[PDB]
Amino acid sequence: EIDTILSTLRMEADPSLHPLFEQFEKFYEEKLWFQLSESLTKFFDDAKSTPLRLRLYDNFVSKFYDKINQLSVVKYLLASLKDSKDFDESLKYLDDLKAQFQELDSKKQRNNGSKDHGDGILLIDSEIARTYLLKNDLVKARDLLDDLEKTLDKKDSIPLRITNSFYSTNSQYFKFKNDFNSFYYTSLLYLSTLEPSTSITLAERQQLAYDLSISALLGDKIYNFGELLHHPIMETIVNDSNYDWLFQLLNALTVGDFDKFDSLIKVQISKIPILAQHESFLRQKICLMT
Amino acid sequence: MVLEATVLVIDNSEYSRNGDFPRTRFEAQIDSVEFIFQAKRNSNPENTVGLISGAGANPRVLSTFTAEFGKILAGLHDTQIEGKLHMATALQIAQLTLKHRQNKVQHQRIVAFVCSPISDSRDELIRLAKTLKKNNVAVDIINFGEIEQNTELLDEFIAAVNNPQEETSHLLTVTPGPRLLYENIASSPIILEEGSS
Amino acid sequence: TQELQTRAKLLDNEIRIFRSELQRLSHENNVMLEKI
Amino acid sequence: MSLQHEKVTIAPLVLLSALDHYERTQTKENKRCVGVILGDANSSTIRVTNSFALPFEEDEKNSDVWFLDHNYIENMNEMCKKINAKEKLIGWYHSGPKLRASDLKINELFKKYTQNNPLLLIVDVKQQGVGLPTDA
Amino acid sequence: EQEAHNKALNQFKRKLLEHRRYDDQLKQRRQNIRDLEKLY
């Protein structure tokens, strides 16, 4: 039954991605639930790019969830719907998982004696909110975030990954409404506290880095440049093409030289349609800074 | 067993949930802990047992010396499985736990369940081993987590400890494959073990 | 006739898990009373 | 937990107690003492009413090695709630001389007991401070 | 009979019937702690 699913996955996979698939079958059998989680974890991190995920995840999430950490279950589902460009699909799978955790805790709590399951709750709701924002059902999203915020404060502490996921959703909503100041401020909190998960790659830094820089350029009160440099996002990478021109704007501000600033911006006005229309802001900002 | 105080170290690393012993290994170990405690009490009433953790960053005293299975099980009924073994820290602390005693004639013994490989420098544990033995603390390893996914490095350490002591250290090997954890332990020396006393 | 045997071993272990639980709950009533 | 901990008032009796406890365990000259501090809380002014020595062993080879007898802190608390119910677990004092990163770990163990945030009262019993030898 | 699974069932019947009882004892005891807390 499951073995048939594993064989399909191996045939489509690369020889290099064969040993990850072969480890799932044996470890499940061997009832090593530690390795069952480890093998899986490697897979979702990077082989989420490939469609391999659809067949392996959904089946494993709907079958053999109970065994591994709950956190590990919701982490894979997250990976699957990242690359998913369908919202009917996304909404379905969430509602289904939520029901499963509810059952699971009836046994598990006594069995281990102690084991949290409230981790999975919050993350589900954070994902659902976000689904609604992209669907541009902004109103639903607003009240779900608010509720999470209240819930969260009753807890003294949560994982890095929990507050990083709250923050990520909130930052998305703010750039949608083009509340530039609030996007940037919440984005700072996100960087500091960041998931130890390595889903965040160099390309994901770059994507986030264009928006963060735009919000602060058009401001007249944002002066958190020193914090920016030191944060992972610009720390590891400065030497891409996005960070050639954009970082030079940034430098030009800091040295407080308007002659350089003028030169760069004219070229960037044709290329960038955000900078074309916000000319007035860019000049005001540099003035107040010096 | 006569005039003996034995602290059980329960280790509920992330390899405690491994379903190798039915239904899970974690629940298999409760049965094991109940097994050891009742047997040693009935044999000698001066036998006492406390319960400490090998898990988390810093150990937790759940229970003191007792001839009460209720006191041990209440603490056991609620425990985390996401803690992790830190053997080196644990060894020095177990000794400290052992200074208070129903009476001093009782021996110093640790029985420790092991569900995961060592998480510490190998070389350090040899040095700690020889600090324990001056004060005559002997340490019996029910081994089954080291030989899941790593080679057996425990033999070196058991040899180092072994000296004339109130009791001797023992290596008792239990196969990690299904056989029910309490069941191997009942067939292993636990009360058929012996010292140099 | 095979399945009933194989099932008998699963129920045997279930006897013990129930009995351990019961003992803790009996202990708890005894402790609460003395304080009353 | 609770976030109301805006003021700390300190009975002089507490102060007197902290040296007394230090000397009766025969801890001295970089041997540390941990005791419970009892008093009122879930209130802005934390009122430290009393303190009491606990079983504590200090290891110098590994500074992250210590003993605390966890059961005892429960038991003692039970007795004093009977004497006066207003006293509750509110944290733990250290004798200093200084704060450490081991006191962070120690904090964590008291956090479980405490339904407030555990108050760490650093009583320097030696009193080398020119002013206040007590930090909260 | 000679057949030994015939005898075997008689042991299995008792296990099943004790299991039902251990669940009823379990619920009641949990209830009883609660009642004493209301007194307390």
Side-chain angles (χ1 to χ4, degrees):
Chain A
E1 182 181 356
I2 67 172
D3 310 89
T4 58
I5 292 169
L6 290 168
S7 66
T8 301
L9 289 155
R10 290 171 184 156
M11 289 162 73
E12 286 188 46
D14 295 299
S16 66
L17 284 181
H18 292 179
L20 286 176
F21 287 108
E22 297 169 14
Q23 286 176 263
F24 305 142
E25 201 175 1
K26 304 165 178 160
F27 303 153
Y28 166 80
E29 279 174 25
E30 285 203 80
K31 300 203 173 189
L32 308 142
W33 294 1
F34 182 72
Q35 294 294 294
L36 177 49
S37 178
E38 183 149 18
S39 54
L40 298 165
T41 287
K42 291 187 283 179
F43 191 85
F44 86 84
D45 191 69
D46 43 80
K48 73 172 182 56
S49 285
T50 66
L52 274 166
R53 68 189 205 274
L54 281 169
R55 286 161 301 282
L56 179 56
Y57 299 169
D58 290 285
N59 291 92
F60 279 36
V61 166
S62 206
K63 291 167 160 165
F64 314 112
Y65 67 108
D66 304 321
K67 306 176 149 68
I68 63 171
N69 194 303
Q70 186 173 299
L71 179 60
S72 294
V73 168
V74 61
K75 284 168 67 176
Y76 314 151
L77 179 59
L78 191 70
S80 185
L81 296 175
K82 216 167 189 175
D83 296 354
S84 295
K85 308 177 189 171
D86 190 71
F87 307 82
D88 290 281
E89 180 180 7
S90 296
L91 279 162
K92 196 44 169 62
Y93 290 143
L94 291 169
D95 293 9
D96 287 353
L97 187 58
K98 188 168 183 178
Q100 279 170 274
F101 297 167
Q102 205 183 63
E103 296 302 310
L104 179 63
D105 56 66
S106 304
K107 291 179 181 178
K108 286 298 183 187
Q109 186 58 270
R110 291 173 171 190
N111 285 139
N112 305 121
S114 311
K115 186 170 169 183
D116 197 70
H117 300 285
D119 45 316
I121 292 170
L122 312 139
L123 287 167
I124 291 159
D125 290 348
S126 192
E127 185 55 9
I128 287 171
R130 187 201 321 276
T131 303
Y132 296 144
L133 294 164
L134 296 171
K135 286 185 50 187
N136 298 311
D137 294 302
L138 296 177
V139 185
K140 311 177 185 167
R142 178 79 285 194
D143 53 89
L144 286 168
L145 290 171
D146 305 332
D147 287 343
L148 279 156
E149 182 63 12
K150 295 181 291 181
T151 304
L152 284 166
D153 298 310
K154 292 177 182 179
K155 282 186 193 297
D156 306 322
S157 52
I158 66 289
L160 292 183
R161 184 170 176 100
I162 294 296
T163 47
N164 185 65
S165 189
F166 181 77
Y167 288 147
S168 50
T169 307
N170 282 277
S171 295
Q172 199 177 271
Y173 191 5
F174 304 153
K175 72 176 166 187
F176 285 171
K177 301 174 296 206
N178 299 267
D179 303 357
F180 286 154
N181 309 119
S182 60
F183 168 67
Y184 185 83
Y185 295 168
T186 310
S187 305
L188 208 70
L189 299 189
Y190 163 96
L191 289 160
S192 296
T193 61
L194 188 64
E195 63 177 42
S197 296
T198 62
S199 73
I200 304 300
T201 49
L202 292 178
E204 287 293 287
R205 297 183 164 86
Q206 294 177 56
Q207 201 172 80
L208 297 174
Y210 176 80
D211 302 277
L212 273 70
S213 284
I214 288 282
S215 308
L217 276 156
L218 299 182
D220 296 283
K221 48 186 204 177
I222 290 191
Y223 297 115
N224 299 292
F225 292 83
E227 302 300 88
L228 196 74
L229 298 155
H230 285 71
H231 285 302
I233 183 158
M234 289 301 296
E235 170 183 298
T236 51
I237 194 70
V238 297
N239 292 322
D240 307 306
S241 46
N242 190 59
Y243 295 133
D244 284 336
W245 55 284
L246 191 44
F247 191 55
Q248 285 170 19
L249 300 180
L250 206 82
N251 302 147
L253 284 169
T254 63
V255 296
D257 182 81
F258 296 69
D259 281 21
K260 185 172 169 176
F261 189 59
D262 182 33
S263 311
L264 301 166
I265 288 289
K266 300 286 180 193
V267 186
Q268 305 295 327
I269 277 166
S270 48
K271 195 172 100 79
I272 306 290
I274 293 169
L275 297 177
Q277 65 184 283
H278 300 295
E279 174 70 354
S280 52
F281 297 96
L282 300 153
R283 308 291 171 170
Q284 176 179 32
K285 172 76 185 314
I286 184 157
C287 295
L288 293 171
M289 197 181 295
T290 318
Chain B
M1 299 178 80
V2 286
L3 293 174
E4 280 183 19
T6 300
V7 292
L8 298 179
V9 175
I10 310 303
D11 179 5
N12 295 122
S13 60
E14 283 179 59
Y15 305 75
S16 198
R17 71 176 183 272
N18 285 314
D20 296 318
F21 299 115
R23 292 174 159 84
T24 46
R25 167 185 277 167
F26 180 78
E27 298 165 31
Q29 287 164 274
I30 302 184
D31 296 311
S32 297
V33 168
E34 295 309 286
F35 173 56
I36 293 169
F37 173 85
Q38 295 299 356
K40 283 183 177 172
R41 185 172 63 82
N42 287 36
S43 166
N44 173 244
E46 303 166 279
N47 191 272
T48 55
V49 179
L51 176 65
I52 62 171
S53 310
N58 208 278
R60 309 181 199 278
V61 180
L62 300 177
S63 310
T64 52
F65 295 112
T66 192
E68 187 50 72
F69 80 86
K71 186 156 287 186
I72 298 314
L73 179 47
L76 290 171
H77 179 70
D78 296 318
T79 183
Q80 290 293 345
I81 61 168
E82 301 298 322
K84 182 54 199 286
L85 177 66
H86 294 93
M87 183 179 290
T89 303
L91 291 171
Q92 293 171 308
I93 292 170
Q95 184 173 277
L96 292 179
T97 290
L98 289 168
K99 292 177 187 174
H100 181 271
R101 250 170 299 158
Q102 186 175 274
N103 51 98
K104 309 318 156 168
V105 196
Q106 303 191 24
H107 310 141
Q108 301 171 87
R109 308 194 60 185
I110 299 170
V111 176
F113 303 88
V114 172
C115 296
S116 33
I118 58 184
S119 310
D120 314 301
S121 305
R122 188 186 57 73
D123 304 295
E124 177 58 17
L125 295 172
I126 293 168
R127 312 302 180 183
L128 296 173
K130 283 178 292 189
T131 298
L132 290 171
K133 56 179 294 175
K134 289 294 169 305
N135 308 318
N136 316 311
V137 186
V139 187
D140 305 80
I141 304 301
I142 309 178
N143 178 55
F144 42 105
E146 201 178 70
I147 61 173
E148 289 192 276
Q149 67 179 54
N150 199 241
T151 44
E152 183 176 301
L153 304 162
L154 272 162
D155 186 84
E156 304 160 7
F157 301 147
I158 296 300
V161 173
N162 276 301
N163 185 73
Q165 284 174 111
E166 295 159 334
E167 279 295 299
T168 57
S169 41
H170 284 71
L171 187 46
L172 302 173
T173 314
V174 175
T175 45
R179 181 72 197 87
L180 293 156
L181 190 55
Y182 81 97
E183 195 174 9
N184 295 294
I185 295 166
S187 298
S188 55
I190 64 166
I191 59 178
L192 277 69
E193 291 180 321
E194 60 282 294
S196 299
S197 291
Chain C
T1 65
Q2 300 184 110
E3 290 291 271
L4 291 77
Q5 181 73 62
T6 312
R7 177 159 182 186
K9 279 184 269 302
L10 316 180
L11 287 169
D12 197 76
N13 293 111
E14 189 192 290
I15 292 168
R16 184 177 190 156
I17 314 158
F18 296 150
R19 286 183 179 154
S20 292
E21 290 172 272
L22 284 180
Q23 288 161 65
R24 165 170 56 74
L25 291 171
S26 314
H27 215 48
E28 283 181 286
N29 283 277
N30 290 118
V31 170
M32 176 59 53
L33 192 58
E34 300 297 298
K35 301 166 192 175
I36 292 168
Chain D
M1 292 176 70
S2 67
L3 299 175
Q4 289 184 298
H5 56 251
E6 289 78 354
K7 180 176 52 175
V8 185
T9 59
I10 301 172
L13 181 59
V14 172
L15 295 173
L16 293 173
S17 296
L19 180 59
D20 196 66
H21 295 174
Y22 197 64
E23 306 294 347
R24 282 175 83 80
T25 47
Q26 198 53 57
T27 57
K28 59 172 177 194
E29 303 304 304
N30 300 63
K31 280 174 179 299
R32 307 150 83 79
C33 205
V34 165
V36 66
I37 54 170
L38 302 173
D40 292 346
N42 194 31
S43 188
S44 294
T45 308
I46 297 301
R47 184 61 173 84
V48 200
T49 47
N50 206 344
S51 67
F52 182 77
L54 304 172
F56 183 79
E57 301 163 30
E58 180 174 4
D59 183 62
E60 304 275 53
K61 316 168 180 186
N62 189 340
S63 67
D64 309 314
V65 165
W66 62 85
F67 176 61
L68 271 168
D69 178 341
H70 298 160
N71 286 343
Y72 176 64
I73 295 168
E74 288 291 312
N75 290 340
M76 191 65 188
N77 184 49
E78 290 297 306
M79 292 301 295
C80 296
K81 287 188 285 185
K82 291 181 182 182
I83 293 168
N84 196 51
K86 294 176 182 176
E87 288 187 352
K88 63 179 181 180
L89 298 175
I90 62 169
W92 62 285
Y93 71 80
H94 184 229
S95 55
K98 295 183 180 180
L99 181 65
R100 290 281 191 283
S102 67
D103 292 327
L104 289 166
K105 292 177 183 178
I106 288 172
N107 192 72
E108 185 63 20
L109 302 163
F110 285 98
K111 185 179 177 187
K112 180 177 179 180
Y113 286 84
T114 56
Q115 61 97 233
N116 46 284
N117 278 315
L119 180 66
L120 162 50
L121 200 65
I122 311 191
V123 185
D124 177 333
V125 301
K126 291 184 177 183
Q127 302 174 70
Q128 311 174 2
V130 182
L132 294 165
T134 298
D135 299 288
Chain E
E1 320 168 294
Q2 183 283 128
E3 194 186 53
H5 196 80
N6 199 235
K7 313 286 204 181
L9 294 181
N10 309 311
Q11 287 82 62
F12 306 162
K13 284 173 191 157
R14 194 177 199 104
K15 289 188 193 286
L16 185 75
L17 294 169
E18 289 186 11
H19 290 321
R20 301 177 189 285
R21 295 204 266 276
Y22 290 132
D23 282 291
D24 303 321
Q25 289 165 75
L26 271 161
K27 50 182 272 309
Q28 284 293 291
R29 282 174 222 270
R30 284 177 193 277
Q31 184 53 58
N32 205 274
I33 292 168
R34 292 182 283 279
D35 298 300
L36 294 186
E37 290 175 20
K38 288 166 181 73
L39 301 179
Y40 180 54

